Design an enzyme around this catalytic site. Structure first.
Site, PDB file in Angstrom:
ATOM      1  N   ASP A  79      51.131   3.442 -26.519  1.00  0.00           N
ATOM      2  CA  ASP A  79      50.224   2.814 -27.483  1.00  0.00           C
ATOM      3  C   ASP A  79      50.945   1.831 -28.404  1.00  0.00           C
ATOM      4  OD1 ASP A  79      48.174   4.306 -26.361  1.00  0.00           O
ATOM      5  OD2 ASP A  79      48.202   5.856 -27.932  1.00  0.00           O
ATOM      6  N   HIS A  87      42.386   1.647 -26.076  1.00  0.00           N
ATOM      7  CA  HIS A  87      42.694   2.742 -26.979  1.00  0.00           C
ATOM      8  C   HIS A  87      41.665   2.725 -28.098  1.00  0.00           C
ATOM      9  CE1 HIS A  87      45.166   5.744 -28.957  1.00  0.00           C
ATOM     10  NE2 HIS A  87      44.873   5.107 -30.078  1.00  0.00           N
ATOM     11  N   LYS A 113      32.785   3.059 -28.392  1.00  0.00           N
ATOM     12  CA  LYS A 113      32.679   2.661 -26.988  1.00  0.00           C
ATOM     13  C   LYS A 113      31.851   1.395 -26.794  1.00  0.00           C
ATOM     14  CE  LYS A 113      33.721   6.936 -24.653  1.00  0.00           C
ATOM     15  NZ  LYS A 113      33.279   7.933 -23.633  1.00  0.00           N
ATOM     16  N   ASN A 119      33.958   2.735 -19.561  1.00  0.00           N
ATOM     17  CA  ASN A 119      34.735   1.500 -19.572  1.00  0.00           C
ATOM     18  C   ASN A 119      34.808   0.887 -18.176  1.00  0.00           C
ATOM     19  OD1 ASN A 119      36.117   0.552 -22.209  1.00  0.00           O
ATOM     20  ND2 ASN A 119      36.283   2.782 -22.297  1.00  0.00           N
TER      21      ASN A 119
END
Ligand SMILES: Nc1nc2[nH]c(CCCc3csc(C(=O)N[C@@H](CCC(=O)O)C(=O)O)c3)cc2c(=O)[nH]1
Ligand SMILES: NCC(=O)N[C@@H]1O[C@H](COP(=O)([O-])[O-])[C@@H](O)[C@H]1O
EC number: 6.3.4.13
Length: 200
Positions: free
Chosen positions: A144, A108, A170, A13
């Site tokens: 979250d 997330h 991803k 990321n």
């Protein structure tokens, strides 16, 4: 806007954010990468991109507040405006979250509010969903549960494992995290005073 990226591991990321924030029209610049773990691949990616790094080992601190204070000192050192949590796996303390309210983003690997926590793919597979995805949200104290900025759905294929599902998700994370960072850094999206997301 000046950005810190916090990591705990591989840093895929982080790499997508490096790539996006270096495009000419980027409203964000990454000025520091902080890992809570030494010798992870994300640090190599930051160093290859010529971005400064710090390792702040949470295990050296008495509690979360002291660890978070050490992070905060570095954020102030680099005059940071926005924090991105990119595979960063520590729960942050209340006062740190409050200080950075509306200025801290997390990725997330589920479609929140489903599958909160540290093993979202395991949960998705156990539950048997055929659609999962990823979420970028503002960080609130409750983990979250902060305000959602972007999401992208990703199919679950029969026979998927954490390895194959996480790989597929991803690809979507690397799309929506850069897009969300640009929305916040450009001032297009902000956390409203009423606590809800505001598209200007
Ligand atoms: N206040 C707050 N902190 C946050 N940190 C992160 C980013 C991380 C979200 C996260 C999900 S589960 C988990 C966790 O259990 N961390 C453990 C360590 C577990 C491990 O080492 O794998 C812990 O911190 O004790 C961490 C997101 C987020 C948030 O929205 N709110
Ligand atoms: N609780 C947060 C969480 O599970 N984060 C997840 O960790 C992975 C980090 O990969 P990366 O280091 O290659 O970016 C990503 O899938 C990210 O969404």
């Amino acid at each position: 806007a000046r950005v810190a990226v916090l990591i705990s591991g591989t840093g895929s990321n982080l790499q997508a954010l490096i790539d996006s924030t270096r495009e000419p029209n980027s409203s964000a610049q990454i000025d520091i990468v902080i890992s809570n773990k030494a010798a992870v691949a994300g640090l190599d990616k930051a160093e290859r991109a010529g971005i400064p790094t710090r390792v702040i080992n949470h295990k050296l601190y008495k509690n979360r507040v002291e660890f978070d204070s050490a992070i905060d000192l570095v954020l102030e050192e680099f005059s940071i405006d926005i924090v991105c949590l990119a595979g960063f796996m520590r729960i942050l303390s209340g006062p740190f979250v409050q200080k950075w309210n509306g200025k801290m983003l997390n990725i997330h690997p589920s479609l929140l509010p489903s599958f909160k926590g540290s093993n979202a793919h395991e949960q998705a597979l156990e539950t048997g969903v055929t659609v999962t995805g990823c979420t970028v949200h503002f960080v609130a104290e409750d983990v979250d549960a902060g305000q959602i900025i972007l999401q992208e759905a990703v199919p679950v294929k029969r026979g998927d494992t954490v390895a194959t599902l996480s790989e597929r998700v991803k690809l979507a994370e690397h799309k929506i995290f850069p897009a969300a960072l640009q929305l916040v850094a450009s001032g297009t999206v902000q956390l409203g005073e009423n606590g809800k997301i505001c598209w200007v």
